[PDB]
Design a protein around this nucleic acid. Structure first.
Length: 71
DNA sequence: GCCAGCGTTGGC
DNA sequence: GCCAACGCTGGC
């Protein structure tokens, strides 16, 4: 349970994926997933992400939780 | 006033 | 019963 963040190959250049494990409460150990744009904007849901990227690329098979396209 | 960190909940 | 999506707010 450590924070990890770096480039997401399923998204355009400069986009990054991050996992932050929750450290306390009932949901402790749960891992939230976020994405960051090149400009550093923080995304925490696929609908949010799709309003920025959904025109520029196909997101219909992008799995927000895993960060990969569903083959 | 912001926002990281967690809880709530509707849809499945 | 799980979890995507997001509401809420203590601590700053």
């Amino acid at each position: 349970m450590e924070r990890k963040r770096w480039e997401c190959p399923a998204l355009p250049q400069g986009w990054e994926r991050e996992e932050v494990p929750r450290r306390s409460g009932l949901s402790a150990g749960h891992r939230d997933v976020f994405y960051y744009s090149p400009s550093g904007k923080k995304f925490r849901s696929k609908p949010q992400l799709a309003r920025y990227l959904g025109g520029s690329m196909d997101l219909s098979t992008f799995d927000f939780r895993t960060g990969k396209m569903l083959m």
